[PDB]
Design an enzyme around this catalytic site. Structure first.
Site, PDB file in Angstrom:
ATOM      1  N   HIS A  56      83.709  43.294  92.660  1.00 54.35           N
ATOM      2  CA  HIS A  56      83.112  42.196  93.396  1.00 54.35           C
ATOM      3  C   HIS A  56      82.743  41.010  92.529  1.00 54.35           C
ATOM      4  O   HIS A  56      83.074  39.871  92.849  1.00 54.35           O
ATOM      5  CB  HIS A  56      81.886  42.711  94.153  1.00 54.35           C
ATOM      6  CG  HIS A  56      81.330  41.738  95.154  1.00 54.35           C
ATOM      7  ND1 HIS A  56      82.053  41.256  96.189  1.00 54.35           N
ATOM      8  CD2 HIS A  56      80.066  41.156  95.254  1.00 54.35           C
ATOM      9  CE1 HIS A  56      81.285  40.408  96.905  1.00 54.35           C
ATOM     10  NE2 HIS A  56      80.075  40.357  96.333  1.00 54.35           N
TER      11      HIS A  56
HETATM   12  O1  LIG Z   1      76.312  40.513  97.173  1.00 55.61           O
HETATM   13  C1  LIG Z   1      75.327  40.348  96.422  1.00 55.61           C
HETATM   14  O2  LIG Z   1      75.443  39.890  95.265  1.00 55.61           O
HETATM   15  C2  LIG Z   1      73.953  40.710  96.936  1.00 55.61           C
HETATM   16  O3  LIG Z   1      73.964  40.654  98.359  1.00 55.61           O
HETATM   17  C3  LIG Z   1      73.041  41.538  98.977  1.00 55.61           C
HETATM   18  C4  LIG Z   1      72.419  40.826 100.179  1.00 55.61           C
HETATM   19  O4  LIG Z   1      71.048  41.222 100.344  1.00 55.61           O
END
Ligand SMILES: O=C(O)COCCO
Length: 285
Positions: free
Chosen positions: A266
């Site tokens: 990610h």
């Molecule tokens: O995707 C992220 O970095 C954190 O996202 C969580 C939302 O609370």
């Protein structure tokens, strides 16, 4: 003013993360119809503009591995997304997709941008797609990295890990899930992320609604894209299946260069900065 003790602590950690910025920058605020928006500017003042929109909960400070390369060629503005855990201060924010595009419109207008390159990761990638679809006249081209939803809905585990952040060892659980090696993140950056999660008595986040974010664009919406897009996804992505995401994006978006990157998940900008830095530059050039 009125920041809680947890808010002050978050602000301090944010400032400490800015010491990871390896180039000269300035922090400042821009007034928008939805409140004061924090911006970090780097790069030659006369260079073409580039706008960065960070991932959820991470703030603009996350761009430390990328900013030396990108800033060498572009006047680069790292914008804290209004309503998210960062230095931007939301006022009268309903949270619709229309509102968010108009927020970014104001930022562009106030920075004197005509057209700009854009890079957005996670939440910022979703904002980027929403903006380029509404206002192609303002976006030269866009790099969308590991976007929040956008092409596919979240896997349910995303909701669970995100929720779990505030309980017991939630921060550690989240990071170990999202990252094959969370040690690629600087400890100072992580300290800030933790302080963000602990800061819970500040601005109230808009309840997720159908007309807001997150959002998955329809087939017709994707077909309507009139801006060149580079879509980067990570092989180790956990928020959805990255190959399924590439498939849908490539099926509908007219002008797309999409790829699933090796040895990254990610937060691919932080895991593979050498590759990601050059790849984005090559696309813009
Ligand atoms: O995707 C992220 O970095 C954190 O996202 C969580 C939302 O609370």
């Amino acid at each position: 003013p009125e920041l809680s003790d947890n808010g002050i602590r978050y602000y301090q950690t944010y400032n400490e993360s800015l010491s990871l910025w390896p180039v000269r920058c300035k922090s400042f605020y821009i007034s928008t119809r939805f409140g004061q928006t924090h911006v970090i500017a780097s790069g030659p003042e006369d260079a073409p503009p580039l706008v960065l929109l960070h991932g959820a909960l991470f703030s603009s400070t996350m761009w430390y591995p990328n900013i030396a390369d990108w800033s060498s060629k572009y006047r680069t503005y790292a914008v804290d997304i209004i309503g998210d855990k960062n230095k931007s201060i939301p006022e009268n924010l309903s949270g619709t997709r229309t509102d968010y595009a108009n927020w970014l419109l104001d930022v562009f207008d106030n920075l004197g941008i005509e057209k700009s390159h854009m890079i957005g990761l996670s939440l910022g990638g979703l904002h980027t797609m929403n903006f380029l679809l509404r206002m192609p006249e303002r976006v030269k081209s866009a790099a969308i990295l590991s976007p929040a939803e956008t092409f596919l809905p979240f896997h349910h585990d995303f909701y669970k890990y995100a929720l779990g952040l505030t309980a017991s060892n939630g921060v550690e659980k989240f990071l170990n899930w999202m990252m094959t090696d969370q040690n690629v993140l600087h400890p100072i950056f992580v300290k800030q992320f933790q302080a963000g999660v602990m800061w819970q008595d500040g601005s109230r986040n808009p309840n997720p609604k159908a007309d807001g974010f997150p959002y998955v664009f329809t087939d017709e919406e994707l077909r309507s894209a009139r801006v060149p897009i580079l879509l980067l996804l990570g092989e180790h992505e956990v928020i959805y299946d990255p190959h399924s995401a590439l498939h849908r994006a490539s099926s509908f978006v007219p002008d797309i260069e999409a790829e699933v990157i090796k040895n990254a998940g990610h937060v691919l900008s932080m895991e593979q900065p050498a590759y990601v830095n050059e790849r984005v530059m090559r696309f813009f050039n």
